[PDB]
Amino acid sequence: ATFEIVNRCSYTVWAAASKGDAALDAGGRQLNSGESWTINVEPGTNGGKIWARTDCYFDDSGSGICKTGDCGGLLRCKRFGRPPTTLAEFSLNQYGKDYIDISNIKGFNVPMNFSPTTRGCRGVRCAADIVGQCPAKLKAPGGGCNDACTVFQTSEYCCTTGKCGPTEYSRFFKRLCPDAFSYVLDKPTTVTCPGSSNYRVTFCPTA
């Protein structure tokens, strides 16, 4: 499966691709406005995540800081980015099928469009201006909009035992972005796609 990552945002983003334990292809690249970054994700990839890191600085070695989505300080990510981050989550080749979705479970930082380039399935979009309408407590001082579990650390927001339900802060992400996951046990908006499909992740699709 080939993923094309496009930065349509006016500002520079540092795209990142990782499955938590290892990197996906390069695992991270600076994306100027309008730049497209093509990566090859190995088939059978389970639980891969693509997100955008904003306001990043890096030395020649590749170690630096990001205001949102920093993955241990490295340009090329080996683990998942730190909240808040809009997440494009995909599981490839799962019994002859592919599974994609966009998640606000870890907050929000950049509007995202996750669409398949090949025929078969529909794409997901979370392009609502969540940061502007972000509630006061969920506001991350370094940009973006945090989730509830990151801010408050309670069994209800975090769904530790998988018995939680919707809250104030989950319904906020749900009302702005209906097509994305607001919390762990949210009704699945995951789109099923033909196996071995190709995708495109776009930051700021509407603008």
Swiss-Prot record:
In terms of PROSITE patterns, this protein maps to: THAUMATIN_1, THAUMATIN_2
Q: Where in the cell?
A: Cytoplasmic vesicle
Gene3D superfamilies from the UniProt entry: Thaumatin
User: Cross-referenced InterPro entries, in alphabetical order?
Assistant: Osmotin/thaumatin-like_sf, Thaumatin, Thaumatin_CS
Q: Could you confirm whether the keyword Disulfide bond appears in this record?
A: yes
Please report any disulfide bonds recorded for this protein chain, giving both cysteine positions: 9-204, 56-66, 71-77, 121-193, 126-177, 134-145, 149-158, 159-164
This protein's GO cellular component annotations are: cytoplasmic vesicle
What are the alphabetically sorted keywords of the record?
Cytoplasmic vesicle, Disulfide bond, Signal, Taste-modifying protein
Q: What is its main location?
A: cytoplasm
**Protein purpose:** Taste-modifying protein; intensely sweet-tasting. It is 100000 times sweeter than sucrose on a molar basis.
In the record, the note on similarity to other proteins reads:
Belongs to the thaumatin family.
**Do you know which PANTHER family this protein is assigned to?**
OS03G0233200 PROTEIN
Q: What is this protein called?
A: Thaumatin I
Q: What organism is recorded for this protein?
A: Thaumatococcus daniellii
